Amino acid sequence: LIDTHVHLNDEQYDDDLSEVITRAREAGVDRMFVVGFNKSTIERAMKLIDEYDFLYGIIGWHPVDAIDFTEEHLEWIESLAQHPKVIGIGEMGLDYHWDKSPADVQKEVFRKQIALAKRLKLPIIIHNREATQDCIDILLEEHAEEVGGIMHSFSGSPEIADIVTNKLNFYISLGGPVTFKNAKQPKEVAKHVSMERLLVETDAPYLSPHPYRGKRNEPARVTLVAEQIAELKGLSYEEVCEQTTKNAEKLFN
Ligand code: NI
Ligand code: NI
């Protein structure tokens, strides 16, 4: 089992990182993909991947911080990407919940990263918050299908899901929301989407799945996400772990 999207580089783990890692390790979580989307979070991610063998890095620039993105950050990320542990360019996309960065700048920075991924020949990890259509529109126009990737913690509909799996040959990743009771969409997506297109994550410290809602997430909780998807699709737990793992390795290597 792999946690394909985890912020171990977050400040909330300063004090107990090694223990958090260990608990995930003992629970069956073999590999984890740390996401650096900032100057600071990127540096932390690079350190962590050199620190732990089973830790891989995905680096890029978060849409919320699109205004801070400069040509120097672009070049910097480009050379950093040479690291054999950096397997994807990420947490790029659009986010309309915060206003730090206007939609205009976000789109620009988004396009630039897609071009970066193309040159680096690496898949992209997409962050989308309340900007679904604008986001798919850009992945189509820039021919993102050329690099492939993940619609991380997918917060849209199955109709949009098919667009991501059919036109774009992208995978869909689910986290805690799939265990939420009153939010039916994440579950409907879990059931609709082919097991050959799904991946699991926690995006910890955020969005803990039941029965830990309201508490800081931890990659070990990804087991709960797998469990729920197994029940939702009438599959075995072991089958889900193996399928999502097969998928992650095929997308990243
Ligand atoms: Ni996110
Ligand atoms: Ni994230």
Experimental approach was X-ray
Q: How far is the CA of 25 from the centre of ligand 1 (A)?
A: 23
Distance from C-alpha of 139 to C-alpha of 171, rounded to nearest angstrom: 13
Q: How far is the CA of 38 from the centre of ligand 1 (A)?
A: 13
Ligand 1 being an ion, which residues bring their Cβ within 5 A of it?
A: 127
List phi, psi (to 5°) of 216: -70, 130
Distance from C-alpha of 97 to C-alpha of 154, rounded to nearest angstrom: 16
Q: Which domains does the chain have, with CATH numbers?
A: 1-253 (3.20.20.140)
Per-residue exposure over 105-140, b if at least 16 CB sit within 10 Å of its own CB, e if not: bbbebbebbbebbbebebbbbbbbbebbebbbebbe
Provide the token pair at 245.
């793992």
Measured CA angle at 69 (ends 65, 75), to 5 deg: 140
